[PDB]
Design a protein around this ligand. Structure first.
Ligand SMILES: CCCCCCCCCCCCCCCCCC(=O)OC[C@H](CO[C@@H]1O[C@H](CO[C@H]2O[C@H](CO)[C@H](O)[C@H](O)[C@H]2O)[C@H](O)[C@H](O)[C@H]1O)OC(=O)CCCCCCCCCCCCCCCCC
Ligand SMILES: CCCCCCCCCCCCCCCCCC(=O)OC[C@H](CO[C@@H]1O[C@H](CO[C@H]2O[C@H](CO)[C@H](O)[C@H](O)[C@H]2O)[C@H](O)[C@H](O)[C@H]1O)OC(=O)CCCCCCCCCCCCCCCCC
Ligand code: CLA
Ligand code: CLA
Ligand code: CLA
Ligand SMILES: CC(C)=CCC/C(C)=C/CC/C(C)=C/CC/C(C)=C/CC/C(C)=C/CC/C(C)=C/CC/C(C)=C/CC/C(C)=C/CC/C(C)=C/CC1=CC(=O)C(C)=C(C)C1=O
Ligand SMILES: CC(C)=CCC/C(C)=C/CC/C(C)=C/CC/C(C)=C/CC/C(C)=C/CC/C(C)=C/CC/C(C)=C/CC/C(C)=C/CC/C(C)=C/CC1=CC(=O)C(C)=C(C)C1=O
Ligand SMILES: CCCCCCCCCCCCCCCC(=O)OC[C@H](CO[C@@H]1O[C@H](CS(=O)(=O)O)[C@@H](O)[C@H](O)[C@H]1O)OC(=O)CCCCCCCCCCCCCCC
Ligand SMILES: CCCCCCCCCCCCCCCC(=O)OC[C@H](COP(=O)(O)OC[C@@H](O)CO)OC(=O)CCCCCCCCCCCCCCC
Ligand SMILES: CCCCCCCCCCCCO[C@@H]1O[C@H](CO)[C@@H](O[C@H]2O[C@H](CO)[C@@H](O)[C@H](O)[C@H]2O)[C@H](O)[C@H]1O
Ligand SMILES: CCCCCCCCCCCCO[C@@H]1O[C@H](CO)[C@@H](O[C@H]2O[C@H](CO)[C@@H](O)[C@H](O)[C@H]2O)[C@H](O)[C@H]1O
Ligand SMILES: CCCCCCCS[C@@H]1O[C@H](CO)[C@@H](O)[C@H](O)[C@H]1O
Ligand SMILES: [Cl-]
Ligand SMILES: [Cl-]
Lengths: 36, 200, 34, 334, 37, 49, 137, 97, 56, 243, 30, 97, 34
């Protein structure tokens, strides 16, 4: 159960970091018109 | 951004007035839902014990204690449906609580008349009532003019918090569109999808 | 569970008969000259 | 180029068959987890002690259910609002007995579905669209939050969440009526107006546009071939439709502005369903439907029954019978 | 994608359908007693 | 029309009122188990769909 | 049907002496009953102790008898258990315990008589519904 | 062979009078003077071989003995039934209004 | 075969009539009345306050 | 020492108080004086259920089971008189306390065995001549095991003993003979046996601790099926005070 | 047998979702 | 977003006609059955299992208990021509409520 | 007669599955041009 807990915590943190850093990565510019 | 923040705050306020009895004193706002449910168990524990019941050893129909049982981690708690509300804490109840949860000796020997009064008051002022302010469960007959300030404040702020989330999405989506320059529609002369490869 | 003994064949034929009808029609449409 | 940059470009790419996006990065694992657990539980989960009274209710197909009666049963009343992941259990056996799958499924689903809404904003932005499709989806999403999260919170237990099954849904509805008189609540009434009206306006719009399709086909072919994907011209005559519908009621009851019409088609059911969701979400805190029990009284004081009192009698039957072994004290306070 | 040139049309003429249905039905008429047992 | 005509009388037809209709819904749950009817379920799908 | 003087005529004491209440007294009784009592005694039951109700026949078998104005007025001043053995002002609303039950604080003799009158008149109107609970709703 | 013991007991004096060995405490409200003080004493000191044994409860006042004698005609005793006395059911039988 | 007509009677020898099930009801309680429609016996659900049981 | 907030949610509230490894003393009994057990606690650590083989010729074993009802299993706050008999043996007579817990355990393969783990109406006696309670003292006795469900309990079709339908109403015209066992509810009342071996004594405080083994029947679902034999093992704590 | 039948129908549906999404007739601008 | 999309405007608008119209027609058919009490009331297999096995419970059996409550509690006032008198003891009720 | 209950479904599918396969092939042959 401890191993499962750690695994899920790591997995969740991984995807959360992708979400956060992803949206920080110049997201407003990611559109078809004003890319600036 | 501010709408998103206020929505979040609205939902928090809803939960504050519903569960907290410190900054929302039950003396002024009435008992919480958990509180009034606990108070009913307390009320009947007192009454039946006064009649001679050994409340600690009283097995209920299901096999669980009629008045007293254990939480999933072992603490002694009130029985019946209020098993869900064992996280409740309140000044009228805490004198009966020891290191292991509710204390059978204290229950037998130390329940004061003020505790009985309070339990009965809170049990009979539970935050249940109709939109036209008829107190109690939906099947109650007209008589008592009562809806809890806790229900009024929880419901209102959930509604407001929800519409403010809708407002957040509306304005967040529009702000993005307007800043990128397409909040008024797609440019017929430069339709972005037309310049994209087909999906299949 | 003591279910009706015709339930299986009723369901199987309910699925297969019209599905087959559709499959027949589709495949013969595809095979027509384009 | 840079590895992170190339990943970001792939994630947000307008060229993937299914759009991923940043909301998709949370949506995909959570919806897969919810889905996989749901399917496995619906088929094979053992009986679950929903009401915390050691009375386990069978939800799964292998344990004697069919499609209609089967459910993923809500977590135990003994748990209440406590967070009950797999690692909080001593074993999977315990976890299954106590309704662990339900919590796993509903939390992943609500997260995944919230991201589904965000993803809808996201692709609209990538494609240069206006952004409010996600706002329309917020109505069903809010409704899901109401029955899986808000209602349990108010009542103090996930055992009062809507069960994940067909008969379990009906159980939830009937108990809800007994305890809140939801039918006599104007937010549910607005909800019904939303869905009856939405279905009405759906049939209306479909019939009117279909009625005025421009002849582009022969008798021995479907009229649908008269339209081609991406054609510049409109496929029906809105003047003809308006001329028909304006005479059906009166001229000014009929839309001649398509943008106004389609906004109305969006707004009516969306607003109605918002009120539906808020009905459940406010009855969660026991602000209940109108109570006119014994409202009409004669000169002497005899109660003169109305239809409200007949409803009350039905509500009583539901109330006294539900969870027949769970109540020890006279009032059902949550 | 470009078409796969290995693709080929498939045929079953009327006589083959009749012969096939006869095979199937007669096999069913034969084996059915054993299926019911 | 058809429903009350199959029953004992018009009495069990819906009465024309808001609460009266709610009573008709609840009667159908308790007496007919109408929610379990697949024809009703298809109706629900059509309306919500 | 009407709320006649006959209906409003209830026992004043256990000797068979009666009082005829005015229509105003009745409406006052209802209002004060709702104000101070209905939270527990709505419809003639007792939410915190369903074993004891406010039916006339039940009040008659109380010690001392409570099926009259004076019995009821006295109960409102000094409540006892059903057998008269215990004084229960500490847990039941009364003038004696008006300090801890503040809704009793401004109640006059005329108020209590009105409350008592309501308790006696309602069952004459509502029958077995009074004190009958949800079964009779 | 298999019988419902509660239904069977309804056919004895239990179904006619207050059974001092089995009946739930709220039944003592039916007659003047019994509830709660005597009712508590009666249930606590059960079972009784005969109705008149109720007069022998230690600590009864002379007044209480008088009240009891006046109510013996409303009392009975039958064999203790486990189904009726377990679960503290004599003190709360899950019936309210 | 017909089992014959069932005539119910209480200890007093009064004839009692079983209330018949209407078509609407999937299930129906057992209630017995005299010739005037006065309830004289039934099969109780809760037993603790039963007054009309067949045993009584 | 510890408060509720130190304990809440940890699992410790389902554990009985322990005694130090050094607590191996003796608690004197004065036959002039009357005694009580002020607190008796029982914490089960193993639930075993006797196998029921088709081959009723082999010696059937008690086997390990998995607990599915969480940390809700302990008996505590139990009190009663501790009589001193003529032969110097002590007899504990259980009077009151949290003296039962419904428990569900699961056999290999998934079969759930509910039981009312209990010591209701316990009467337990030591060997004669216990001038002082030591680590050689033990109590043996019997207790009652009432029905796991009480008389109000309604089965899923609403049938019960003190309440409910008395037939299968969803089968209005079925023959009733083969359903008699499920239709006619019965209230079980059986005996259990227990041994408490004292392993630790604090002579100064009057506290004792050790292990216990108890045998009793499991739930019979109000006469619907045969019960199973359960063997419960664990630890206990008792504090004795001169009354 | 019932459970097999229910799971089978469900599985066919999920398979249909797959083909309907990935092996759809491609929408084309003429 | 969803995996599939309309590409034909005419099909789209016809489908919008088809869905709610077909739905209401289906519900009409079920009501025609209810005219005759020809209900989808029970699952026979569920009832056979539950009658034999007092530990078997599903959401289906739970809902039937609610229906039985509804019937007994609403019928006397809802069907006054029947002159139902259901003495309190016959009314189906769970514990306490 | 106490026949095997799966005999009906076995016979039905044994007939229907291959018969349907042939019908699919035949019809899509007919609908081809020449
Ligand atoms: C196609 C179109 C769509 C159609 C769908 C329709 C959905 C809308 C719903 C319509 C609602 C009808 C209201 C009429 C009912 C009424 O007469 O209501 C009467 C009630 C008062 O009822 C009285 O309430 C009393 C309460 O009694 C209690 O209190 C009494 C003293 O007050 C006594 O003490 C008594 O003993 C005690 O029991 C008694 O019950 C009386 O008998 C009873 O008549 O009014 C109140 O509750 C006041 C509160 C009213 C709230 C209404 C809100 C609903 C509006 C939603 C829309 C919002 C959107 C905003 C955007 C713009
Ligand atoms: C139908 C047509 C609809 C047309 C569509 C247009 C939309 C507009 C909707 C408004 C409808 C008009 C209702 C106005 C009448 C009214 O309200 O009348 C009610 C009262 C005035 O009447 C008094 O109402 C009182 C209400 O009880 C209150 O007072 C009692 C006695 O002191 C008790 O203390 C009780 O606890 C307490 O709740 C009592 O019943 C009094 O006897 C009675 O005189 O007006 C008030 O309160 C003031 C109301 C403003 C406050 C509302 C905010 C709180 C709502 C947030 C919850 C969100 C969830 C909503 C769900 C729906
Ligand atoms: C935070 C908001 C809030 C809350 C929780 C309360 C709470 C309360 N009020 Mg106060 N009040 C408020 C704001 C609030 N009020 C406002 C804005 C006014 C000015 C009109 C008042 C003036 C007022 C008076 C004069 C009185 C009260 C009274 C009361 C009590 C009874 C309420 C009642 O019966 O409602 C009845 C229910 C309704 C009227 C239904 C409201 C439904 C609304 C219209 C729907 C809201 C949804 C949303 C906003 C719409 C979004 C649209 C969407 C499509 C975008 C209760 C304690 C009474 C009291 O007891 O005083 C001591 C009383 O007499 N209030
Ligand atoms: C109709 C509209 C409406 C109405 C009538 C109300 C009314 C109310 N709201 Mg709600 N709110 C609304 C809309 C509304 N709100 C919307 C749209 C949102 C966003 C979704 C919110 C979010 C919200 C939250 C989070 C909370 C409320 C709360 C409240 C209550 C307390 C308000 C308060 O004290 O603020 C605070 C006042 C200020 C911020 C102004 C400054 C006040 C100063 C700092 C106080 C200083 C006092 C100090 C002790 C004096 C010191 C002197 C000393 C030196 C001697 C009140 C009943 C509270 C509540 O009761 O929740 C249940 C609460 O927590 N509202
Ligand atoms: C998810 C929730 C849900 C949904 C979406 C539905 C949906 C439906 N229900 Mg079901 N219901 C539910 C839950 C639900 N139900 C539950 C839990 C129960 C308890 C068992 C019921 C009990 C129930 C019953 C008893 C009935 C339904 C019926 C229906 C259908 C009604 C269609 C309709 O529009 O009639 C509305 C009426 C019409 C369309 C007739 C024509 C109306 C004309 C055009 C109106 C003329 C208006 C005119 C201008 C005058 C206006 C005056 C103004 C002043 C008022 C529809 C399929 C009905 C059905 O099945 O019908 C066959 C039905 O009888 N339901
Ligand atoms: C025997 C005797 C005396 C005989 C005499 C008879 C006689 C000749 C009489 C003459 C005198 C006379 C006329 C008397 C009348 C008496 C009278 C007033 C009777 C009342 C009858 C009665 C009850 C009428 C009911 C009124 C009624 C129809 C109300 C409903 C109105 C209403 C709210 C309609 C909905 C409005 C609405 C939102 C519509 C939009 C729907 C929608 C989304 C459509 C989609 C859509 C719309 C478009 O717009 C176009 C374009 C397209 C594409 C499209 O998708
Ligand atoms: C392990 C196991 C077994 C698990 C399963 C357990 C379980 C509980 C399974 C559930 C069983 C189940 C599904 C039960 C439901 C059965 C039931 C009631 C069926 C109803 C059947 C029936 C015939 C009903 C009659 C009424 C009827 C026809 C309803 C149809 C409803 C329906 C399909 C509506 C459409 C829904 C929908 C999502 C449409 C999307 C359309 C779409 C892509 C729009 C997007 C769009 C919009 C635009 O505007 C434009 C311009 C474009 C371009 C565009 O794209
Ligand atoms: C019990 C444990 C269960 C274990 C589960 C196993 C995990 C699966 C791992 C295997 C991955 C392979 C599957 C690919 C299928 C696919 O979609 O490809 C089709 C295309 C092709 O990929 C395209 O691939 C291209 C390369 S090529 O074409 O493949 O050569 C590339 O050029 C392009 O950029 C790329 O988008 O994929 C995409 O469009 C982008 C990725 C979309 C992701 C799918 C979303 C899934 C959502 C599910 C949530 C809903 C819940 C379920 C409800 C029923
Ligand atoms: C992250 C992605 C998440 C998406 C998950 C996958 C969702 C699956 C989508 C449905 C695919 C199947 C569609 C087949 C049918 C199909 O391929 O449709 C394709 C069709 C395309 O229409 P066109 O306009 O291109 O062509 C129509 C005419 O020209 C043909 O004559 O779309 C529709 O008709 C929309 C209306 C039907 C919408 C039906 C919605 C289905 C909801 C699911 C209900 C069943 C659930 C049962 C649960 C057990
Ligand atoms: C439950 C039992 C069900 C059994 C299911 C068995 C499925 C059998 C599927 C048969 C598949 C036939 O597949 C079909 O072949 C024909 C040729 O024969 C193809 O047709 C192709 O060739 C023909 C002949 O030159 C051209 O006219 C046509 O334009 C071209 O597309 C179809 O594009 C293809 O769809
Ligand atoms: C820990 C608690 C303390 C609070 C934390 C406060 C610190 C916040 C720091 C946020 C740092 C974000 O830094 C952000 O990184 C991304 C990705 O590398 C950059 O993104 C940039 O580079 C990547 C390539 O790698 C491109 O895909 C992207 O188009 C481009 O804009 C942003 O331009 C930069 O602003
Ligand atoms: C894809 C595999 C997931 C299915 C796992 C099913 C749980 S395992 C399952 O449990 C039952 C009850 O304990 C046993 O009777 C049975 O022998 C066992 O196979
Ligand atoms: Cl239920
Ligand atoms: Cl309870």
């Amino acid at each position: 159960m401890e191993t499962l807990k750690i695994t899920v915590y790591i997995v969740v943190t991984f995807f959360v970091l992708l979400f956060v850093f992803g949206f920080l990565s110049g997201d407003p510019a990611r559109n078809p018109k004003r890319k600036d | 951004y501010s709408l998103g923040a206020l929505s979040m705050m609205g939902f928090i306020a809803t939960c504050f007035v519903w569960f907290n009895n410190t900054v929302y004193p039950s003396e002024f706002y009435g008992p919480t839902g958990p509180e009034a449910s606990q108070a009913q168990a307390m009320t009947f524990l007192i009454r039946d014990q006064k009649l001679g019941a050994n409340v600690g050893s009283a097995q209920g129909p299901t096999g669980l204690g009629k008045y007293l049982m254990r939480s999933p981690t072992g603490e002694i708690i009130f029985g019946g449906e209020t098993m869900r509300f064992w996280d409740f804490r309140g000044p009228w109840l805490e004198p009966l609580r020891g290191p292991n949860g509710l204390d059978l000796n204290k229950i037998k020997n130390d329940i004061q008349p003020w505790q009985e009064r309070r339990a009965a008051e809170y049990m009979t002022h539970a935050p249940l009532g109709s939109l036209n302010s008829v107190g109690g469960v939906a099947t109650e007959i007209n008589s008592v003019n009562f809806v809890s300030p806790r229900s009024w404040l929880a419901t209102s702020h959930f509604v407001l918090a929800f519409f403010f989330l809708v407002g957040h999405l509306w304005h967040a989506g529009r702000a993005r569109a307007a800043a990128a320059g397409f909040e008024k529609g797609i440019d017929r002369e430069s339709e972005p999808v037309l310049s994209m490869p087909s999906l299949d | 569970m003591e279910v009706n003994q015709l339930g299986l064949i009723a369901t199987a034929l309910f699925v297969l008969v019209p599905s087959v009808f559709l499959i027949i029609l589709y495949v013969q449409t595809e095979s027509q000259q384009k | 180029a840079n590895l992170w940059e190339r990943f970001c470009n792939w994630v947000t790419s307008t060229d993937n068959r299914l759009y991923v996006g940043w909301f998709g990065v949370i949506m995909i694992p959570t919806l897969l987890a919810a889905t996989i657990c749901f399917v496995i539980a619906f088929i094979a989960a053992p009986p679950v002690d929903i009401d915390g009274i050691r009375e386990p209710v069978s939800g799964s197909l292998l344990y004697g259910n069919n499609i209609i009666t089967g459910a993923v049963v809500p977590s135990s009343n003994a748990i209440g609002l406590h967070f009950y992941p797999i690692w909080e259990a001593a074993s999977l056996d315990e976890w299954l007995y106590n309704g662990g799958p339900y919590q796993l499924i509903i939390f992943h689903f609500l997260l995944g579905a919230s991201c589904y809404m965000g993803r809808q904003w996201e692709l609209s932005y990538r494609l240069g669209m206006r952004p409010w499709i996600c706002v329309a989806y917020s109505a069903p999403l809010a409704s899901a939050f109401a029955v899986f999260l808000i209602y349990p919170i108010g009542q103090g237990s996930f055992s009062d969440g809507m069960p994940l099954g067909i008969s379990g849904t009906f159980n939830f509805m009937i108990v809800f009526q007994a305890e809140h008189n939801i039918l006599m609540h104007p937010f549910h009434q607005l909800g019904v107006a939303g869905v009856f009206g939405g279905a009405l306006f759906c049939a209306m719009h479909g019939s009117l546009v279909t009625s005025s399709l421009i002849r582009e086909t022969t008798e021995t072919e479907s009229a649908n071939y008269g339209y081609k994907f991406g054609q510049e011209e409109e496929t029906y005559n809105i003047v003809a439709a308006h001329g028909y519908f304006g005479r059906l009621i009166f001229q000014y009851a009929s839309f001649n502005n398509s943008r106004s019409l389609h906004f109305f088609l969006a707004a009516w059911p969306v607003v109605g369903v918002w009120f539906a969701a808020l009905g459940i979400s406010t009855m969660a805190f026991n602000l209940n439907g109108f109570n006119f029990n014994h409202s009409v009284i004669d000169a002497k004081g005899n109660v003169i029954n109305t239809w409200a009192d007949i409803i009350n009698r039905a509500n009583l039957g539901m109330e006294v019978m539900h969870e027949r072994n769970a109540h020890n004290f006279p009032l059902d306070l949550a | 994608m470009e078409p796969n040139p290995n693709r080929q049309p498939v045929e079953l003429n009327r006589t083959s359908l009749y012969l096939g249905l006869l095979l199937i039905l007669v096999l069913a008429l034969l084996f059915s007693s054993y299926f019911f047992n | 029309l058809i429903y009350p005509l199959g029953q004992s009388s018009w009495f069990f037809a819906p009465s024309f009122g808001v609460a009266a209709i709610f009573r008709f819904l609840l009667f159908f749950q308790g007496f007919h188990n109408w929610t379990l009817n697949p024809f009703h379920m298809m109706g629900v799908a059509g309306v919500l769909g | 049907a009407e709320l006649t003087p006959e209906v409003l005529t209830v026992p004043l004491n256990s000797e068979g002496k009666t009082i005829t209440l005015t229509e105003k007294q009745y409406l006052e009784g209802k209002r004060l009953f709702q104000y101070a009592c209905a939270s527990c005694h709505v419809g003639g039951i007792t939410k915190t102790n369903p074993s004891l109700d406010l039916r006339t026949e039940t009040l008659a078998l109380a010690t001392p008898p409570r099926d009259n104005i004076e019995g009821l007025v006295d109960y409102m001043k000094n409540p006892t258990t059903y057998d008269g053995e215990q004084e229960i002002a500490e847990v039941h609303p009364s003038l004696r315990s008006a300090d801890i039950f503040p809704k009793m604080r401004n109640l006059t003799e005329k108020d209590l008589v009105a409350i008592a009158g309501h308790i006696l008149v309602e069952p004459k109107i509502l029958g077995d519904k009074w004190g009958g609970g949800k079964v009779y709703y | 062979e298999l019988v419902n013991v509660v239904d069977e007991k309804l056919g004895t004096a239990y179904g006619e009078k207050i059974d001092l060995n089995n009946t739930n405490i709220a039944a003592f409200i039916q007659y003047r003077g019994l509830y709660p003080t005597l009712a508590k004493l009666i249930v606590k000191n059960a079972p009784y071989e005969s109705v008149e044994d109720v007069l022998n409860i230690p600590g009864l006042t002379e007044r209480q003995k008088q009240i009891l004698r006046e109510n013996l005609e409303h009392f009975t005793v039958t064999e203790v039934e486990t189904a009726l006395v377990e679960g503290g059911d004599r003190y709360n039988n899950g019936l309210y209004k | 075969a017909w089992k014959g007509h069932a005539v119910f009677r209480n200890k007093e020898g009064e004839e009692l009539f079983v209330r018949r099930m209407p078509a609407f009801f999937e299930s129906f309680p057992v209630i017995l009345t005299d010739k005037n429609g006065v309830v004289k016996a039934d099969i109780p659900f809760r037993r603790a306050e039963s007054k009309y049981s067949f045993e009584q | 020492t510890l408060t509720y907030d130190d304990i809440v949610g940890t699992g410790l509230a389902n554990k009985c108080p322990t005694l130090d490894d050094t607590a191996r003393g003796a608690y004197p009994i004065d036959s002039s004086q009357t005694y009580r057990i002020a607190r008796l606690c029982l914490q089960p650590t193993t639930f075993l259920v006797k196998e029921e083989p088709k081959n009723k010729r082999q010696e059937a074993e008690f086997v390990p089971t998995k607990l599915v009802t969480r940390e809700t299993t302990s008996l505590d706050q139990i009190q009663g008189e501790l009589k001193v008999n003529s032969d110097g043996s002590l007899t504990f007579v259980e009077e009151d306390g949290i003296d039962f817990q419904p428990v569900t355990v699961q056999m290999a393969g998934g079969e759930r065995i509910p039981l009312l783990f209990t010591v209701k109406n316990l009467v337990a006696s030591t060997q004669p001549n216990v001038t002082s309670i030591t680590t050689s003292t033990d109590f043996k006795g019997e207790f009652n095991v009432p029905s796991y469900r009480t008389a109000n309990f309604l089965d899923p079709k609403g049938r019960g003993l003190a309440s409910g339908y008395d037939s299968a109403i969803a089968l209005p015209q079925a023959k009733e003979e083969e359903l008699a066992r499920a239709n006619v509810k019965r209230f079980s009342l059986t005996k259990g046996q227990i041994s408490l071996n004292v392993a630790k004594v604090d002579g100064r405080t009057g506290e004792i601790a050790g292990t216990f083994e108890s045998e009793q029947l499991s739930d019979d679902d109000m006469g619907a099926h045969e019960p199973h034999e359960v063997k419960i093992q664990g630890v206990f704590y008792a504090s004795i005070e001169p009354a | 047998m019932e459970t097999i039948t229910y799971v089978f129908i469900f599985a066919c549906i999920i398979a249909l979702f797959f083909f309907a999404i990935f092996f759809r007739e491609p929408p084309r601008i003429t | 977003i969803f995996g599939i999309a309309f590409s034909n405007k005419r099909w789209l608008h016809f489908f919008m006609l088809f869905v709610p119209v077909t739905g209401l027609w289906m519900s009409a058919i079920g009501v025609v059955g209810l005219a005759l009490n020809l209900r989808s009331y029970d699952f026979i297999s569920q009832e056979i299992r539950a009658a034999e096995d007092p530990e078997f419970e599903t959401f289906y059996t739970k809902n039937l208990l609610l229906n039985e409550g509804i019937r007994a509690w609403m019928a006397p006032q809802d069907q006054p021509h029947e002159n139902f008198v259901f003495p309190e003891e016959v009314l189906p009720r769970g514990n306490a409520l």
